């Protein structure tokens, strides 16, 4: 995996459903997935009901997180303390 953590990061979340997202900057979630809430490049980009988060696997790709970034429905996931 990576070595350093993502800056701005907030916390980790867990999906509760399987939502296949196929976009140029989407975030695929699978019922029981792990995602990290990170601060997007702007609130104007943030979608209504969806926020900018990264999957655990993407974390390992922190090297290219800029290309691992995506959007996911928060109302479809769960926050992890």
């Amino acid at each position: 995996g990576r070595l350093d953590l993502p800056p701005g990061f907030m916390f980790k979340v867990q999906a509760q459903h399987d939502y296949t997202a196929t976009d140029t900057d989407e975030l695929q979630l699978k019922a029981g997935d792990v995602v990290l809430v990170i601060p997007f490049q702007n609130p104007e980009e943030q979608d209504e009901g969806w926020l900018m988060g990264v999957k655990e696997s993407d974390w390992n790709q922190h090297k290219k997180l800029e290309k691992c970034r995506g959007v996911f429905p928060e109302n479809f996931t769960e926050r992890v303390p």
Partner: peptide, 14 residues
């Protein structure tokens, strides 16, 4: 029973 949200736009991060 989490209700699935509506289709979101192409959120191109940069």
């Amino acid at each position: 029973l989490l209700p699935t949200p509506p289709l979101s736009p192409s959120r191109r991060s940069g």
